Design a protein around this motif. Structure first.
Motif, PDB file in Angstrom:
ATOM      1  N   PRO A 166       3.791   0.236  -5.674  1.00 18.17           N
ATOM      2  CA  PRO A 166       3.552   1.554  -6.262  1.00 18.17           C
ATOM      3  C   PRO A 166       3.599   2.660  -5.222  1.00 18.17           C
ATOM      4  O   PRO A 166       3.231   2.474  -4.062  1.00 18.17           O
ATOM      5  CB  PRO A 166       2.144   1.417  -6.846  1.00 18.17           C
ATOM      6  CG  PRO A 166       1.464   0.494  -5.884  1.00 18.17           C
ATOM      7  CD  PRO A 166       2.526  -0.461  -5.374  1.00 18.17           C
ATOM      8  N   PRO A 190       0.824  -1.209   0.000  1.00 17.19           N
ATOM      9  CA  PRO A 190       0.000   0.000   0.000  1.00 17.19           C
ATOM     10  C   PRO A 190       0.856   1.257   0.000  1.00 17.19           C
ATOM     11  O   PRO A 190       2.054   1.232   0.289  1.00 17.19           O
ATOM     12  CB  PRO A 190      -0.796  -0.123   1.301  1.00 17.19           C
ATOM     13  CG  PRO A 190       0.137  -0.835   2.210  1.00 17.19           C
ATOM     14  CD  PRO A 190       0.937  -1.788   1.351  1.00 17.19           C
ATOM     15  N   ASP A 191       0.211   2.370  -0.334  1.00 18.08           N
ATOM     16  CA  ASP A 191       0.903   3.655  -0.370  1.00 18.08           C
ATOM     17  C   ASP A 191      -0.131   4.766  -0.386  1.00 18.08           C
ATOM     18  O   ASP A 191      -0.994   4.796  -1.271  1.00 18.08           O
ATOM     19  CB  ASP A 191       1.813   3.753  -1.586  1.00 18.08           C
ATOM     20  CG  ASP A 191       2.807   4.883  -1.473  1.00 18.08           C
ATOM     21  OD1 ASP A 191       3.819   4.710  -0.759  1.00 18.08           O
ATOM     22  OD2 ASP A 191       2.575   5.943  -2.089  1.00 18.08           O
ATOM     23  N   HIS A 194      11.082  -1.809  -4.529  1.00 19.38           N
ATOM     24  CA  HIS A 194      10.129  -1.302  -3.546  1.00 19.38           C
ATOM     25  C   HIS A 194      10.547   0.059  -3.013  1.00 19.38           C
ATOM     26  O   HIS A 194      10.878   0.206  -1.832  1.00 19.38           O
ATOM     27  CB  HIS A 194       9.931  -2.282  -2.393  1.00 19.38           C
ATOM     28  CG  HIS A 194       8.616  -2.108  -1.700  1.00 19.38           C
ATOM     29  ND1 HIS A 194       8.300  -0.973  -0.984  1.00 19.38           N
ATOM     30  CD2 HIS A 194       7.526  -2.907  -1.641  1.00 19.38           C
ATOM     31  CE1 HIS A 194       7.075  -1.085  -0.502  1.00 19.38           C
ATOM     32  NE2 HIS A 194       6.583  -2.249  -0.890  1.00 19.38           N
TER      33      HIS A 194
HETATM   34 CA   LIG Z   1       5.302   1.217  -0.576  1.00 15.70          CA
END
Ligand SMILES: [Ca+2]
Ligand SMILES: [Ca+2]
Length: 290
Positions: free
Chosen positions: A183, A130-131, A251
């Motif tokens: 992402p 997640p981001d 990553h």
């Molecule tokens: Ca990340």
């Protein structure tokens, strides 16, 4: 780059900085989530891990979950720190993104904010990596995904910091096995910049891991390359493919539009993933460069 020394082991990092202290959140070593701290940015030391004991509701949505949690994302927004993290098994689709929160990382006290989004065997995505990203208008979004259909994007409401609306596909890789994950999106001077990781990640010295980016005038809009290739058709201008020392970088995450952090596999140390931090710049066209 920044030559990191000391306890600089990390995997799937996300950088933050409270006061003069840097904090890198990473995939947990053993159980939970790994945290390492630094006063100067070059010397890192171990910090208390997040979730030393597994949360109960993890067994509900990912019963076979590995003891260590993966790919955390840390950021400060709307007066509070938000920590998105993954609960999954490797090469598996039964995944779930959770959320932890605190007012101050140095307190070490994190609140359990519950499930964010789940993926089962029926779904065509994977709820890991997640981001969080904030609009040019100040509204939260969450990008995630790993293989399968690729990178998904959803809008979060300021109240629950959980997904609303529908999922938007922003990056896919159909002719290369969907090898895109990790992402992170950032806005700068009118454009949103989606960074992603290409290809295979856990092969150590021999891993094929790359960092590719794309731009779009709309957060959900078509992300393009310097070549004009849509990231939904495998578009991705490579920012880093590695050198003789550091192999398979990936990553990544960006902080304050000036710092790209990243884990790379040290060829001079049996391929254990270390922490690599760079000051991120932007060329005459606004594209990210080192
Ligand atoms: Ca990340
Ligand atoms: Ca981030």
């Amino acid at each position: 780059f920044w030559d990191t020394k000391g306890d600089n082991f990390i995997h799937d990092p996300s950088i933050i900085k409270e006061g003069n202290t840097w904090y890198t959140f990473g995939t947990g070593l053993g159980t939970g989530l790994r945290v390492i701290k630094s006063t100067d940015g070059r010397n890192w030391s171990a910090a208390p891990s997040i979730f030393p004991t597994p949360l109960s509701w993890w067994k509900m949505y990912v019963p076979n979950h590995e003891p260590h949690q993966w790919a955390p994302d840390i950021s400060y927004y709307n007066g509070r720190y938000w920590l998105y993290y993954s609960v999954s098994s490797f090469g598996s689709n039964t995944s779930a993104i959770g959320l932890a929160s605190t007012d101050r990382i140095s307190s070490g006290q994190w609140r359990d904010d519950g499930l964010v989004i789940r993926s089962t065997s029926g779904d065509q995505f994977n709820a890991i990596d997640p981001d969080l990203v904030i609009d040019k208008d100040g509204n939260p979004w969450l990008s995630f995904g790993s293989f399968w259909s690729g990178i998904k994007l959803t809008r979060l409401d300021k109240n629950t910091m959980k997904p609303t609306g529908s999922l938007y596909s922003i990056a896919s890789r159909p002719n290369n096995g969907g090898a895109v994950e990790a992402p992170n999106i950032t806005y700068k001077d009118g454009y949103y910049y989606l960074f992603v990781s290409f290809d295979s990640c856990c092969k150590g010295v021999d891993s094929t891991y790359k960092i590719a980016y794309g731009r779009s005038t709309s957060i959900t809009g078509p992300y393009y390359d310097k070549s004009g290739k849509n990231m939904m058709n495998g578009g991705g201008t490579i920012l880093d493919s590695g050198n003789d020392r550091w192999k398979g970088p990936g990553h990544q995450d960006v902080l304050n539009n000036s710092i790209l952090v990243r884990h790379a596999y040290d060829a001079l140390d049996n391929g254990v993933s270390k922490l690599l931090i760079n000051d991120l710049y932007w060329d005459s066209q606004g594209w990210p460069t080192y």
